[PDB]
Copies of this chain bind each other. A is one copy, B any other.
Amino acid sequence: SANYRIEHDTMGEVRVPAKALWRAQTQRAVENFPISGRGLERTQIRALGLLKGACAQVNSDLGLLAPEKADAIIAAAAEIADGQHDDQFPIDVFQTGSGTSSNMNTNEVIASIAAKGGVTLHPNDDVNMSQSSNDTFPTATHIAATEAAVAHLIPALQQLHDALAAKALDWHTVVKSGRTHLMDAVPVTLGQEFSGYARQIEAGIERVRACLPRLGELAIGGTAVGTGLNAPDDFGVRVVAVLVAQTGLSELRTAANSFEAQAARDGLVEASGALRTIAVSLTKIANDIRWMGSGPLTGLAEIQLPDLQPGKVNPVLPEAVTQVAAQVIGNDAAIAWGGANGAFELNVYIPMMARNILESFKLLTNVSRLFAQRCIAGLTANVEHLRRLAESSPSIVTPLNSAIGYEEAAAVAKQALKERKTIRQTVIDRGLIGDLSIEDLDRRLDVLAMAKA
């Protein structure tokens, strides 16, 4: 069987692939949890890298760890954090609830990498010095989630907002009939509707920023149960300082309360709530847009979606956005479930929670840029059609009530539909105008003024 170096944990024998930098513990964990076949996300591996490096830096600063060992860890951690080893983390997402396995995985890989550079490290004694698994994995998760929100999800939303706001301006005077309960209503502009979508996204950004104060709080330094036992007293504070300086994420901070920070994962539940709300907003926007398109003769035909690769263009991007929204809502239900079921000094749903929140960040980041660039940007409005429908709608007969009778007017509406003409063109055909000048029919039937832009 293919190249399989042998290794000995006190328990016994074990065969790891030859190109593998992980070691026995990881290989066991691989045999123990063949459940989903999916391992850690890249963003998560990077965060473990950042964290291990910072810890070695601080351990060295406090003179607890020899500088040679520290430097080898730091350089190893840096490759991992730079995404050079995403293929060295084979452990299933569904593992020990504290994330111990993945933590040991990181330690083993760092020692293997340091060894190929002629330095010997003890996975636990050196790489895991001053740390518990119980404070390490949750800290990596909140680092990944915080980076995903600040460096990815927010800029992506900002780009979607800009693209919607641009349409709100270009279409400022594109008048159309409003719809409520799906029925004809008074006039709006396409530009007003898009400023509505634009605000929704802007509010999404505000709600993501509102959760950062708690999403960026870190458990590091709390160790086994939160008492910091066997860590130097200011380990957390120092580690976070190093992480902020290296990543530029001012949002990371030690936890207000070190017990709440390990016994619970409320910050992830809170952030998931914001992601879900954005999914709700996007569902609305994407649904309006595919309806506005929807195809040409038997639908609304208000706008034309660009083709993904340039006439009945399928609303492919709106289908992606709503599918993604559904996934975010599902993930969000799994996160709350795990959030609620901690016991005493440790919540043991972290690997499952991390997987769902990080996927939610990723999906929303990516579909938002796609939606902005390959759909919203290239939309075209059927200006004449929209305006002709607005000017032919019975909803706009009401000003006529001072100029003609309530029954005289309702008849205008009643024929305009029957004979299918504009209201103006109809008030001209029952002979009405004057005694109500033509010049003052135009005034009370000004659909753009009714939209009160």
Write the residues of chain A forming the contact surface with B, with a CB cutoff of 8 angstroms: 9, 11-12, 28, 31-37, 94-98, 134, 177-188, 192-193, 195-200, 203, 206-207, 210-211, 213-214, 224-229, 233, 256-257, 259-260, 263-264, 266, 269-270, 273-274, 276-277, 279-281, 283-284, 287-288, 290-291, 293-300, 308-316, 319-320, 322-327, 329-349, 351-352, 356, 359, 362-363, 366-367, 370, 374, 389, 392-394, 414, 417, 450-452
Contact = CB atoms under 8 A, between A and B. Distances in A.
Given A266-B200, A452-B229, A352 B334 contact: no
Nearest to A224: B186
Nearest to A213: B206
5 contacts: A12-B309, A180-B346, A186-B224, A229-B452, A327-B352
B362 A297 contact: no
Nearest to A327: B334
A288 to B, nearest CB: 6
Contact of A320 (B95, B227, B347): B95
Given A273-B277, A287-B341, A327-B352, 4 more contacts: A37-B362, A179-B344, A186-B224, A329-B340
Given A35-B366, A180-B224, A323 B345 contact: no
Contacts of A287: 341, 343
A103 to B, nearest CB: 14
Contacts of A283: 340-341
Contact of A98 (B11, B180, B211): B180
B298 A389 contact: yes
Residue among A276, A359, A451 with the most chain B CB within 10 A? A276
B264 A196 contact: yes
Contacts of A319: 95-97, 181, 348
B179 A295 contact: yes
Q: In this complex, which of A182, A281, A325, A333 has the most chain B Cβ atoms within 10 angstroms of its Cβ?
A: A182
Contacts of A197: 260
A217 to B, nearest CB: 9
Given A200-B266, A296-B417, A389-B297, A185 B281 contact: no
B214 A182 contact: no
Nearest to A97: B319
Contact of A344 (B193, B330, B451): B193
Given A177-B297, A334-B326, A338-B323, A277 B266 contact: yes
A439 to B, nearest CB: 21
Contacts of A299: 179, 182-184, 300
Nearest to A312: B183
A210 B35 CA distance: 26
A181 B349 contact: no
Nearest to A25: B309
B314 A183 contact: yes
Contact of A214 (B33, B177, B207, B325): B207
A326 B280 CA distance: 14
Contact of A269 (B280, B313, B340, B351): B280
Nearest to A188: B225
Contacts of A213: 206
Top 10 A-B residue pairs of the complex, sorted by shortest distance between their CB atoms: A183-B295, A330-B334, A273-B273, A182-B294, A196-B259, A178-B225, A199-B257, A97-B319, A180-B346, A323-B352
A296 B180 contact: no
Contacts of A330: 330-335, 337, 356
Given A192-B259, A266-B203, A329 B337 contact: yes
Nearest to A353: B326
Given A97-B323, A203-B266, A343-B291, A35 B298 contact: no
A324 to B, nearest CB: 6
Most buried by B among A98, A281, A450: A281
Contact of A293 (B32, B98, B182): B182
B338 A326 contact: yes
A417 to B, nearest CB: 7
A91 B21 CA distance: 30
